[PDB]
């Protein structure tokens, strides 16, 4: 699922799945 | 940023993990 | 959508919708 | 944290916006 174009909710979803209980930051601009 | 590297171009696990806490 | 229990992808989704182009941080532990 | 306030209990917009950049 990660090695593709990922935009908006699709990108946030990938971060959530990959990062797990570490969480993440989403900084689009 | 993340949009340029993963939306506008093909994402990678190596880049996504850079945004994990 | 925000004034309910929100867990896991549901919570990340709410943050994405509310925060818009500011983005957000998700720090579950 | 956010899990305690929005998963384990009822979330709010006032609390969610505290996590926006």
**Of D1, B14, C13, B3, residue with least CA distance to A21:** D1
For D1-21, the DSSP string reads -HIIIIITTT--HHHHGGGB-
Main-chain dihedrals φ then ψ at residue C7, nearest 5 degrees: -125, 150
Q: Which residues of B touch A29 (CB under 8 A)?
A: 1, 3
For A1-29, the DSSP string reads --SS---THHHHHHHHHHHGGG-EEE---
Are D and B neighbours with ≥3 CB pairs closer than 8 A?
no
Q: By CA distance, what is A10's nearest residue in C?
A: C13
Decide if A13 and C8 are in contact by the 8 Å CB cutoff: no
Residues β-bridged to residue C28: none
Q: Experimentally, how was this structure solved?
A: X-ray
Cβ neighbors of D3 (< 8 A, separation 6 or more) are C7, C11, C28, C29
Cβ neighbors of A11 (< 8 A, separation 6 or more) are A26, B2, B3, B6, B7, B11
- Alpha-carbon gap: B21 to the closest alpha carbon of chain A (Å): 5
Where do the domains of chain C lie? 1-29
Q: Nearest Cβ partner of C6 from D6, D20, D21?
A: D6
- Rounded to whole angstroms, how far apart are CA atoms A21 and C3? 23
Reported resolution, Å: 1.5
For B1-21, the DSSP string reads -HHHHHTTTT--HHHHGGGB-
Question: Which runs of consecutive H residues, i.e. helices, occur in chain C?
Answer: 9-19
Residue B7: Cβ within 10 Å count: 17
């Amino acid at each position: 699922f990660v090695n593709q174009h990922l935009c908006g909710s699709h990108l946030v979803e990938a971060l959530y799945l990959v990062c797990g209980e570490r969480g993440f930051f989403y900084t689009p601009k | 940023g993340i949009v340029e590297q993963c939306c506008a171009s093909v994402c990678s696990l190596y880049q996504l993990e850079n945004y994990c806490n």
